[PDB]
């Protein structure tokens, strides 16, 4: 994918999401030439702007340097902007004409990016499929989360998008996915007989899937209330972790095979009520800071009396022979004590204790971020004149995660993007939970800003059987 | 064992073995005070000497400094010497009287050290049992290798020693044993479900037990001939490695249980034929600088036309449910390429190769010496944009081995010393082969001083199933 021209159409160029994360990401990719050499960027938005205005409002987040001002002005040499509405065939045809009025725009692999408001996904995708299809190269679409709110809405959206594009063209992206050691966990799991056969019900006691954040929801508090942590990260990213941990032997490790194993695991998950769900929400930190002094409900853009949770702890199980009866854990949140993303595989104790109850349950952490590291906290003898062992952390282990994911979109690798049927089954899993949520509006348990999360989650892992040192 | 007085009776104080290795070892242990505070040394030999003569003849090897000259003279302040023959009750009673004429010599735990020549073991042990027994404290002895030559001689000698002392008062020592990395193998085997359940026939492909020595037998070539590498290191040290690796369901880590499981494993191995044997012997190096210019047969003290081997590779296959049908490899020798003592636990390949045959058989090396270190050469993905793994050496990891074994003899820990019945069964499984050896005088295959050993050993590893990459 380094020869044929590509177009990275950023719908919503004036959008805050674009200007804050997408344009700086493609700048990072373009200063180092990770995108293909003949890469075009064609923004699009309602507001009538220009390339100079884009420069003026986006340079500070690009944070370029006088050393590579030349590379910067080459980066804007590939840029362009188109003005139009989101539901009008006239402006859509104008966008198509502008795209075709480039270096083989029709031949260019139009890699659409939907950074536009969530309320229009249906209409924008319908217009894109009707008018903005190039019949030469692949036309992938990047749909940003979330993909509906409950089972019925998600099914309708998925069926519409399936009737428009095929799954080879739909790319459901997840920003938080590391893709660096979510990829290394696969190698560790498959290329070992040390971890291979003990990847079953008898040996691995449980799996803890954690994704914490150090910052709250300052400013953009009006986007999280309608959605909730479950639909934001818990149902997409934590299920991605759970599926890539619980998947059976793919036997060909391709994207389709791994997603099919994900579908098999998910189809092997029974219904989940509130009995395996815990919710939590944060409030003002008494030891305040520049942004910690105000809680979630202190954000003026958040509607008063909103029961949207920012912490979700759920336990899943897989009803197949390899994973029969063995538990899995999902934990996440925002504004927690410290940024982290780990997958702790706690193994069973060896049947028959001989070190006088000193045997600690062997672990295997995959700390996706920050300071990426994989380590097995196995236990070995301490040097000296003794015999007793000590639990020791044994380390076993570069574009950023988001630009790596965009590069994977360019390459065509759909390993880490949820499938239509995978999403359908995933929503089927939590349909009772989501219906209860939208019916009764459950009240999450308050927790302190920058804490470790509600104690009910740790109690949930304890009920599962997870052992905390 | 820091209050009651101890005596380290070095029979053969004028002996070369004593003056070269035992007295410097107890000096190393005494400058740091690892012997009990009220420890005594009472040598003994045919030739008449004195403490000053011992000082003059043994000072240079202590490699001490004038700063610790005070500690050295304190170390010789507790030394002693008794003159007498090895087979005379009169001199034995003189020795006993000298012992009783000390600071509670009768109460002292006489820790005898049979460093005296092998040809007299029967008579010396009989006299020691008859006369030199203190009836107050424990009276252990350290019996040095080899423990007989064939099945019948070994059985007679072991039965006599059993009739004299119980198995609590016998220590079949093995200098080469590390006592540290062997000690960590036990922990790595027991305190993990990472290695525990896969410690069976289906997962561990084979085990390689290796022990090499860069220096030959210059000068002392008249000692190795009558014994052979099998009876020197293979049948003691390499079988100790095999028992520690293979023993089933050890139970309490105590000496009794570990040695019982050693007995069970050795009862679960059948007779060794000539078909599982490789022998080798070394010759001089044209390119060598020091001793390498002369080979084993170049030693004037070696009888001409001697077929004693210095390299022996024999594989065992323990026949019980946990280890049914597995290869266990023994490799050893002298004058090899470089010092080493490793246990390479090569596991099976995962059934179903999905990384396009990039999967290398997972290993686990336990380097006993030099530079003790455990590293699992497991395979993980190297950082990059490709979904490919790399075989990476992942490290897992203080007197020396002889000091720690002497301390073990002082403490009473008999986990590292071969048992009477264990020795009987090892000689029973080597009986047909050893009788054929003594009958036909097999000719070992020549190999180069300082090489890696005869190629037939690697052929043996390949035949049993060991994979070399």
Q: What is the DSSP string of B215-256?
A: S--SS-HHHHTTT-HIIIIIIIIIHHHHHHHH-SS--SSSHH
The answer to whether residues B294 and B272 touch, using CB atoms and an 8 Å cutoff, is: no
> For residue A395, how far is the Cα from the chain centroid?
25
Do A128 and A187 lie in one domain? The reply is no
**What is the rounded CA–CA span in Å between residue B149 and residue B308?**
13
> For residue B96, how far is the Cα from the chain centroid?
31
Residue A252 DSSP one-character state: S
Residue B79 located in a structural domain: yes
Residue B171 located in a structural domain: no
- Alpha helix positions (H), A14-50: 16-17, 23-31
Do B125 and B191 lie in one domain? The reply is no
Q: Which of A139, A169, A193 is the last residue of a domain?
A: A139
Contact A194 B396 (CB under 8 A): no
> Dihedrals φ, ψ of A39, to 5°?
-105, 130
**What is the rounded CA–CA span in Å between residue A397 and residue B391?**
12
* Distance set, CA A306 to CA A233, A434, B76 (Å): 19, 16, 86
Return the residue in A182, A194, A406 with the most chain B beta carbons within 10 A, the one to mutate for interface testing.
A194
Contact A380 B387 (CB under 8 A): no
Contact A197 B196 (CB under 8 A): no
**What is the rounded CA–CA span in Å between residue A311 and residue A336?**
9
- Alpha helix positions (H), B219-357: 221-224, 229, 239-246, 255-267
Residues of chain B contacting residue A387, judged by C-beta atoms under 8 Å apart:
183, 187, 253
Do A132 and A261 lie in one domain? The reply is no
Residue A65 located in a structural domain: yes
Residues of chain B contacting residue A253, judged by C-beta atoms under 8 Å apart:
354-355, 387
Residue B188 annotated as binding site: no
Contact A381 B352 (CB under 8 A): no
The answer to whether residues B318 and B326 touch, using CB atoms and an 8 Å cutoff, is: yes
Do A448 and A376 lie in one domain? The reply is yes
Q: Dig out the tokens for B387 from the structure.
A: 């979904």
Residue B126 CB: number of other CB atoms within 10 A? 15
- Which of B190, B362, B374 is closest, CB to CB, to A194? B362
Q: Which residues contact B320 (CB under 8 A, 6 or more apart)?
A: B248, B264, B265, B268
CB crowding A79-114: b at 16 or more within 10 Å, else e: bbbbbbebeeeebbeebbebbeebeebeebbbbbbb
B134 class by beta-carbon count within 10 Å (0-12 exposed, 13-18 middle, 19+ buried)? middle
Residue B214 DSSP one-character state: S
**What is the rounded CA–CA span in Å between residue B360 and residue B207?**
16
> For residue B245, how far is the Cα from the chain centroid?
15
Residues of chain B contacting residue A185, judged by C-beta atoms under 8 Å apart:
none
**What is the rounded CA–CA span in Å between residue B353 and residue B177?**
39
In a 3-state reduction of DSSP, which class is residue A47?
coil
Residues of chain A contacting residue B352, judged by C-beta atoms under 8 Å apart:
249, 251
The answer to whether residues A394 and A235 touch, using CB atoms and an 8 Å cutoff, is: no
Contact A379 B196 (CB under 8 A): no
Measured N-to-C along each axis, helices B420-440 and B255-267 cross at an angle, to the nearest 10 degrees, of 40
- Which of A253, A380, A385 is closest, CB to CB, to B188? A380
How many residues are there in chain B?
Answer: 469
- Which of B197, B251, B394 is closest, CB to CB, to A203? B197
**Separation of first and last alpha carbons in chain B:** 49
Domain interval for residue B370? 181-397+419-464
Residue B1 located in a structural domain: no
CB crowding A185-198: b at 16 or more within 10 Å, else e: bbbbbbbbbbbbbb
Residue A353 DSSP one-character state: -
Q: Which residues contact B458 (CB under 8 A, 6 or more apart)?
A: B468
**What is the rounded CA–CA span in Å between residue A167 and residue A161?**
9
Residue that the structure tokens 């062992």 belong to = A389
Taking the CA of residue A187 and the nearest CA in chain B, the distance in Å comes to 6
> Dihedrals φ, ψ of B200, to 5°?
-140, -170
In a 3-state reduction of DSSP, which class is residue A341?
strand
**What is the rounded CA–CA span in Å between residue A414 and residue B268?**
53
The answer to whether residues A380 and B185 touch, using CB atoms and an 8 Å cutoff, is: no
Q: How many structural domains compose chain B?
A: 2
- Which of A354, A376, A387 is closest, CB to CB, to B183? A387
Residue that the structure tokens 């049992």 belong to = B129
Task: Tell me, in Å, the resolution of the deposited structure.
Answer: 3.5
* Distance set, CA B48 to CA A360, B83, B90, B275, B447 (Å): 59, 5, 16, 51, 44
Residues of chain A contacting residue B397, judged by C-beta atoms under 8 Å apart:
380
Options B103, B237, B348, B416, the catalytic residue: B237
Q: Active-site residue B348, yes or no?
A: no
Q: Which residues contact B333 (CB under 8 A, 6 or more apart)?
A: B211, B212, B213, B229, B280, B310, B311, B312, B453
In a 3-state reduction of DSSP, which class is residue B208?
strand
Do B186 and B244 lie in one domain? The reply is yes
Which residue in A has a C-alpha nearest to residue B188's C-alpha?
A380
> For residue A222, how far is the Cα from the chain centroid?
20
- Which of B203, B253, B394 is closest, CB to CB, to A193? B203
* Distance set, CA B130 to CA A146, B82, B166, B309 (Å): 90, 18, 14, 38
Q: Which residues contact B236 (CB under 8 A, 6 or more apart)?
A: B145, B146, B172, B174, B418
Do A55 and A192 lie in one domain? The reply is no
Contact A362 B193 (CB under 8 A): yes
Do B135 and B192 lie in one domain? The reply is no
Measured N-to-C along each axis, helices A23-31 and A401-411 cross at an angle, to the nearest 10 degrees, of 80
Annotated binding-site positions of A: 12-19, 46, 121, 145, 175-179, 213, 232, 331, 334, 339-340, 344, 367, 369, 375-377, 395-397, 452, 468
Q: Dig out the tokens for A191 from the structure.
A: 């290329």
**What is the rounded CA–CA span in Å between residue A337 and residue A314?**
20
Contact A190 B362 (CB under 8 A): no
Measured N-to-C along each axis, helices A89-100 and A121-131 cross at an angle, to the nearest 10 degrees, of 50
Taking the CA of residue A300 and the nearest CA in chain B, the distance in Å comes to 43
- Alpha helix positions (H), A198-248: 228-229, 239-246
Residues of chain B contacting residue A249, judged by C-beta atoms under 8 Å apart:
352, 354
Q: Which contacts qualify for A350-353: CB closer than 8 Å, 24 or more apart?
A: A350/B190, A350/B191, A350/B192, A350/B193, A350/B196, A350/B197, A352/B249, A352/B251
Compute the C-alpha angle B60/B64/B67, nearest 5°. 140
> Dihedrals φ, ψ of A170, to 5°?
-85, 130
> For residue B98, how far is the Cα from the chain centroid?
33
**What is the rounded CA–CA span in Å between residue B54 and residue B26?**
14
Do A95 and A206 lie in one domain? The reply is no
Residues of chain A contacting residue B387, judged by C-beta atoms under 8 Å apart:
183, 186-187, 253
Residue A174 located in a structural domain: no
In a 3-state reduction of DSSP, which class is residue A416?
coil
> For residue A243, how far is the Cα from the chain centroid?
13
Query: Dihedral angle at the C-alpha atoms of A409, A415, A421, A423, nearest 10 degrees?
Result: -80
In a 3-state reduction of DSSP, which class is residue A148?
coil
Taking the CA of residue A392 and the nearest CA in chain B, the distance in Å comes to 9
Taking the CA of residue A362 and the nearest CA in chain B, the distance in Å comes to 6
Radius of gyration of chain B (CA): 24
Q: Which of A347, A345, A372 is nearest to A208 (CA)?
A: A345
Residues of chain A contacting residue B190, judged by C-beta atoms under 8 Å apart:
350, 354-355, 359
Please report, for the domain that includes residue A331, its CATH number: 3.30.360.10
Q: Which residues contact A253 (CB under 8 A, 6 or more apart)?
A: A186, A190, B354, B355, B387
Cis peptide before A370 (omega within 30 of 0): yes
Please report, for the domain that includes residue B129, its CATH number: 3.40.50.720
**What is the rounded CA–CA span in Å between residue B457 and residue B276?**
10
A2 class by beta-carbon count within 10 Å (0-12 exposed, 13-18 middle, 19+ buried)? exposed
Which residue in B has a C-alpha nearest to residue A378's C-alpha?
B192
Cα dihedral across residues A422, A423, A425, A429: positive or negative? positive
Residue that the structure tokens 């079949």 belong to = B172
Q: Dig out the tokens for A107 from the structure.
A: 């031949």
**What is the rounded CA–CA span in Å between residue B160 and residue B137?**
22
> Dihedrals φ, ψ of B167, to 5°?
-65, -15
Q: Which of B87, B117, B139 is the last residue of a domain?
A: B139
Q: After which residues is chain A broken (C to N over 2.5 A)?
A: 397
Helix (H) or strand (E) holding B188: helix B181-190
Q: Which of A258, A11, A271, A246 is nearest to A142 (CA)?
A: A11
Residue B324 CB: number of other CB atoms within 10 A? 12
Do A85 and A188 lie in one domain? The reply is no
Look at phi and psi of residue A409 and say left if phi exceeds 0, alpha if psi is from -120 to 50, else beta: alpha
Contact B190 A354 (CB under 8 A): yes
The answer to whether residues B407 and B142 touch, using CB atoms and an 8 Å cutoff, is: no
Residues of chain A contacting residue B187, judged by C-beta atoms under 8 Å apart:
355, 379-381, 387, 389
Do A264 and A117 lie in one domain? The reply is no
Which residue in A has a C-alpha nearest to residue B34's C-alpha?
A385
Strand order in the sheet with B373-376: B365-367, B373-376, B394-395
B325 class by beta-carbon count within 10 Å (0-12 exposed, 13-18 middle, 19+ buried)? exposed
**What is the rounded CA–CA span in Å between residue B79 and residue B461?**
50
Helix (H) or strand (E) holding B111: strand B109-114
Q: Which residues contact B406 (CB under 8 A, 6 or more apart)?
A: B8, B25, B26, B29
Contact A251 B348 (CB under 8 A): no
The answer to whether residues A62 and A23 touch, using CB atoms and an 8 Å cutoff, is: yes
Helix (H) or strand (E) holding B190: helix B181-190
Q: Which of A151, A327, A312, A155 is nearest to A237 (CA)?
A: A312
Which residue in A has a C-alpha nearest to residue B391's C-alpha?
A191
Residue that the structure tokens 């064609």 belong to = A42
- Which of B190, B389, B397 is closest, CB to CB, to A350? B190
Q: Which of B115, B139, B163 is the last residue of a domain?
A: B139
Q: Which contacts qualify for B134-137: CB closer than 8 Å, 24 or more apart?
A: B134/B99, B134/B105, B134/B106, B134/B107, B134/B108, B134/B109, B134/B110, B136/B106, B136/B107, B137/B4, B137/B107, B137/B108, B137/B109
> Dihedrals φ, ψ of A109, to 5°?
-75, 90
**DSSP state string for A356-402:** SS-------EEE-SSS-EEEE--EEEPSSS---EEE--EE-----HH
Q: Which of B193, B214, B183 is nearest to B407 (CA)?
A: B183
Do B442 and B347 lie in one domain? The reply is yes
Q: Which of B352, B331, B351, B328 is nearest to B340 (CA)?
A: B331
Do B232 and B323 lie in one domain? The reply is yes
**What is the rounded CA–CA span in Å between residue A295 and residue A216?**
8
**What is the rounded CA–CA span in Å between residue B208 and residue B331?**
7
Residue B119 annotated as binding site: no
Partners of B141 in beta bridges: B112
Radius of gyration of chain A (CA): 24
Count of alpha carbons within 13 angstroms of residue A407, beta-carbon side: 24
Q: Dig out the tokens for B177 from the structure.
A: 């044993």
Count of alpha carbons within 13 angstroms of residue B169, beta-carbon side: 20
Residue B12 located in a structural domain: yes
Pairing of strands B204-212, B171-172: unpaired
**What is the rounded CA–CA span in Å between residue B114 and residue B272?**
31
Q: Dig out the tokens for A233 from the structure.
A: 């990260």
Residue A173 located in a structural domain: no
Contact B348 A193 (CB under 8 A): yes
Residue A380 located in a structural domain: yes
**What is the rounded CA–CA span in Å between residue B464 and residue B462?**
6
Q: Dig out the tokens for B403 from the structure.
A: 């000091």
Options A237, A348, A356, A435, the catalytic residue: A237
**What is the rounded CA–CA span in Å between residue A421 and residue A438?**
23
Measured N-to-C along each axis, helices B151-164 and B121-131 cross at an angle, to the nearest 10 degrees, of 10
């Amino acid at each position: 994918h380094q020869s044929d021209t590509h177009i990275f159409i950023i719908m919503g160029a004036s959008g805050d999401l674009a200007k804050k994360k997408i344009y700086p990401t493609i700048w990072w990719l373009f200063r180092d030439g990770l995108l293909p050499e003949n890469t075009f960027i064609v923004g699009y938005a309602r507001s009538r702007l220009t390339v100079a205005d884009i420069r003026k409002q986006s340079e500070p987040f690009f944070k370029a340097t006088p050393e590579e001002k030349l590379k910067l002005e080459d980066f804007f040499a590939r840029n362009s902007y188109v003005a139009g509405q989101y539901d009008d065939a006239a402006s859509y045809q104008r966008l198509n004409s502008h795209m075709n009025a480039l270096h083989l725009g029709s031949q260019a692999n139009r890699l659409f990016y939907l950074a536009l408001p969530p309320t229009v996904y249906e209409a924008v995708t319908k217009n894109i499929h009707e008018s903005c299809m190039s019949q030469i190269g692949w036309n992938r679409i990047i749909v940003e989360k979330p993909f509906g709110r409950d089972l019925q809405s998600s099914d309708r959206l998925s069926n519409h998008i399936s009737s428009l594009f095929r799954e080879d063209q739909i790319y459901r992206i997840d920003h938080y996915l590391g893709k660096e050691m979510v990829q290394n966990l696969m190698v560790l799991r498959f290329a070992n007989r040390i971890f291979g056969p003990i990847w079953n019900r008898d040996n691995i006691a449980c799996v803890i899937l954690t994704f914490k954040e150090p910052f709250g929801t300052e400013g953009r508090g009006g986007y999280f209330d309608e959605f909730g942590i479950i639909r934001d990260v818990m149902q997409n990213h934590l299920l991605q972790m759970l599926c890539l941990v619980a998947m059976e032997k793919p036997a060909s490790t391709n994207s389709d095979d791994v997603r099919d194993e994900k579908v098999k695991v998910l189809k092997c998950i029974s219904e989940v009520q509130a009995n395996n769900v815990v919710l939590g929400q944060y409030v003002g930190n008494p030891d305040g800071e520049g942004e910690a002094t105000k809680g979630y409900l202190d954000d003026p853009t958040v509607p008063r009396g909103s029961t949207t949770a920012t912490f979700a702890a759920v336990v899943l199980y897989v009803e197949n022979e390899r994973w029969d009866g063995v538990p899995f854990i999902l934990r996440c949140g925002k504004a927690l004590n410290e940024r982290k993303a780990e997958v702790r595989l706690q193994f069973h104790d060896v049947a028959g204790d001989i070190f006088h109850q000193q045997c600690k349950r062997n672990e295997l952490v995959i700390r996706v971020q920050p300071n990426e590291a994989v380590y097995t906290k196995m236990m070995t003898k301490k040097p000296g004149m003794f015999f007793n062992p000590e639990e020791s952390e044994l380390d076993l282990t570069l574009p950023d995660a988001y630009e790596r994911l965009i590069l994977d979109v360019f390459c065509g690798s759909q390993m880490h993007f949820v499938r239509s049927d995978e999403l359908r089954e995933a929503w089927r899993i939590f349909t009772p939970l989501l219906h209860q949520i939208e019916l009764e509006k459950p009240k999450p348990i308050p927790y302190i800003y920058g804490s470790r999360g509600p104690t009910e989650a740790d109690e949930l892992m304890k009920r599962v059987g997870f052992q905390y040192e």
